[PDB]
Amino acid sequence: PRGQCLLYNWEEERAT
Amino acid sequence: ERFVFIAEWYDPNASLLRRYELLFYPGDGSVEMHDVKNHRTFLKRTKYDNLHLEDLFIGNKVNVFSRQLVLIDYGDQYTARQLGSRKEKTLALIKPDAISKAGEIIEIINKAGFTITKLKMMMLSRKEALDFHVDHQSRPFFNELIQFITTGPIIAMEILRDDAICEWKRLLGPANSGVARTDASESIRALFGTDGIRNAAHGPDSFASAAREMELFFPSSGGCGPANTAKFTNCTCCIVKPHAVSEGLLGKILMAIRDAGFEISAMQMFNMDRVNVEEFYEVYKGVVTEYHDMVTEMYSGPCVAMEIQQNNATKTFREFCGPADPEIARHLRPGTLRAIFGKTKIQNAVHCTDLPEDGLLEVQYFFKILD
């Protein structure tokens, strides 16, 4: 998906 | 583990209904109270011995620190699953051939564990008998069946218990008295059935049919149903108190009265209000100091009203009941009802007409004005 790697605002991408 | 109930209390000043959360801990028997409106604690965790787990069902009144709280709701899904899921409500009929042993039948039901919430001894007319036996309108034995159900008074009772329908039908057993005696003699029909036609009992089989029977007998609209068997002549009034009803000695009182020999003219169950109790005890105001104690004991729960006939088997009913204090009754007249079934002067489990003048007025207040 999106935001797999832990950099550059990954938490919001994992949320949405 | 705790059980939560929402309770109403009527404030004597503001004339306001107030909602509280009542939390009971059955592991240790302590209560706690919270306020819904103000979101603050009303009473901390306090060991209250008077409140018990058997007194917790919806619609009940419990006296918690001189406040009468009526439980109206279930607090949460946990207590709604643990208590209200199993409970079922059903109807019991005592036929005219079992009127003499109606006390023993009520005693058997009390040992079975049913809670009686409505009770009425009454006579059924022809149209009400037709509505009762509309399922048997194909007429296998309809003429003699209607004649048997109409020739004498019956007793209709509302009884609540877990698995109530199955337990009551298992208690009654087979319809034929000889078949019931052959199979299992411990059944009510087996013990007190002279024949299959005179089964001396009746029990509904399905939920919709049972609800139809309640709509016929005890009308939810509030209108008057079938008439009571009130004779209004040569009669006295006697009340089985709420503490005696909750303890379960009602069958013993009926058996003791029957063995004494006085005839029960009428019998019903009432849930009284404070003003009705005050106007029933209006003669006791200014005479005794514990008038409020007697009033509060009377409206603390439902009471069983009785009209008792002819009062002359051996002695009058007042001296059969005996002295007002149960300790005095036990010490002086050991055969009296207050000696047998009494605990406190306030809670002595029977009330009798002290004045011979006032008996007809009490019977008129209970069996005419109220119903």
Binding site: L6, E11 | V4, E21, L23, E32, H34, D35, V36, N38, H39, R40, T41, K44, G75, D76, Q77, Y78
Partner: protein, 439 residues
């Protein structure tokens, strides 16, 4: 009304913070997502979670804690863990590069880029707070993050909030046990600050907890999951009077003024009882008179020290569960009749007692036996002066040949600052000597 703010700094503070906050949810019946179960409902007047959790209008509970770490590899475990829906997504502050066991990176070079954001959160949590009572800072003496970043953070709080109590919880470097090699350095650089800014600083170490886990619990090979559960139960026993009702309750200020006699003697010890396994408690009965004697034995001390060398100065017994005050009163007078427990003559009364009503709760999957009563002992002793003695001896052999200094002076730290920090613990050593003498 009663409130506390918890800040977890460094790897040691955050990892215990994972263990203390999982226990706090079980006490108040809060699921890991941050909501209460739908089967059971709470009463209207509940302030039990108001100490640690803040009510959101959507029926969600949010902890009152800040998790600051200069490296991301530990906070990202929390954000990707099973408690990802519990904490605030913005209270979890992270940096880019760690302190690398350097005090100069955590205080002078890298620690000055984030502290404007760190104090912004503490301002927000305190402004939403109605009545604030103290702080609970979790760190360790050894790390560059636990020593460097704690120093400039906590001095800014004393500037901002004047007379608010501040309670650390620090991992003491053990005598024979040490992981880093800059360990004698970073302890000296912390204690130059915590004397004039802290009111009660509690100490625990890894080595004494290892031997407690070896004998009592029969855990032959303890690990970090085992230690942080034991430390988390003491903090939940200290704060138990602000959350629940008790026979006689102790506020944060009440044991703050009863435990420190002098402004430079504010380093109490933590002791918990009974730490026992499941099988041993099945045979041995737990009385009130026995668990209170278990605290005063030297084998149950959670700091590797000998309490028999020094003398006791002030003690605080904090009970929980089904404890009546009559049994405690005869238990204390039993202890004062013993001659091996030596109290100072200038402090005739030294015990203060707090009794609560709720028993401890065991975390499932744990090791601790489920019991009824438990007691946490907070004692101020003079025996910890020997602990500071051997740490200064470790410092003096490093600085004799000027080893490991060129990493510190390369980031902005002066060479001379080691001299003022060393003479401070020279003064702290004889301050314990000056109060321990009799008349």
């Amino acid at each position: 009304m009663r409130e506390c703010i918890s800040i977890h700094v460094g790897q040691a503070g955050v990892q215990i913070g994972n263990a203390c906050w999982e226990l706090y949810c079980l006490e108040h019946g809060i699921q890991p997502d941050g909501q209460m179960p739908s089967d059971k409902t709470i009463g209207g007047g509940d302030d039990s979670f108001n100490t640690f959790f803040s009510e959101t209008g959507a029926g969600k509970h949010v902890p009152r804690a800040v998790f600051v770490d200069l490296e991301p590899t530990v906070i990202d475990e929390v954000r990707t863990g099973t408690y990802r829906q519990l904490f605030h997504p913005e209270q979890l502050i992270t940096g880019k590069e760690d302190a690398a066991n350097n005090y100069a990176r955590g205080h002078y070079t890298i620690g000055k880029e984030i502290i404007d954001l760190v104090l912004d959160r503490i301002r927000k949590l305190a402004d939403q707070c109605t009545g604030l009572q103290g702080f609970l800072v979790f760190h360790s003496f050894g790390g560059g993050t636990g020593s460097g970043f704690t120093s400039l953070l906590m001095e800014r709080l004393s500037v901002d909030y004047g007379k608010k109590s501040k309670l650390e919880f620090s991992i003491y470097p053990a005598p024979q046990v040490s992981t880093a090699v800059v360990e004698p350095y970073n302890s000296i650089l912390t204690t130059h600050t915590t004397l004039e800014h802290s009111d009660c600083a509690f100490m625990v170490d890894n080595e004494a907890i290892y031997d407690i886990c070896r004998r009592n619990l029969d855990i032959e090979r303890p690990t970090y999951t085992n230690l942080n559960r034991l430390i988390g139960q003491i903090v939940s026993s200290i704060t138990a009077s602000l959350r629940f009702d008790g026979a006689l309750n102790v506020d944060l200020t009440e044991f703050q003024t009863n435990l420190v006699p002098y402004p430079r003697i504010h380093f109490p010890l933590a002791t918990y009882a009974p730490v026992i396994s499941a099988e041993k408690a099945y045979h041995e009965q737990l009385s009130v008179a026995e668990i209170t004697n278990a605290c005063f034995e030297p084998a149950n001390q959670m700091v590797k020290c000998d309490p028999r060398h020094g003398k006791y100065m002030a003690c605080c017994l904090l009970y929980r569960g089904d404890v009546v005050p009559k049994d405690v009163n005869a238990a204390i007078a039993t202890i004062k009749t013993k001659r091996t427990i030596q109290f100072v003559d200038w402090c005739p009364t030294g015990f203060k007692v707090g009794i609560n009503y709720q028993p401890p709760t065991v975390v499932p999957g744990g090791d601790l036996a489920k019991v009824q009563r438990a007691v946490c002992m907070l004692s101020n002793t003079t025996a910890i002066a020997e602990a500071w003695a051997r740490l200064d001896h470790k410092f003096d052999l490093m600085y004799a040949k000027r080893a490991f200094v060129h990493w510190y002076v390369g980031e902005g730290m002066e060479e001379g600052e080691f001299s003022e920090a060393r003479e401070d613990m020279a003064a702290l050593e004889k301050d314990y000597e000056e109060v321990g003498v009799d008349s």
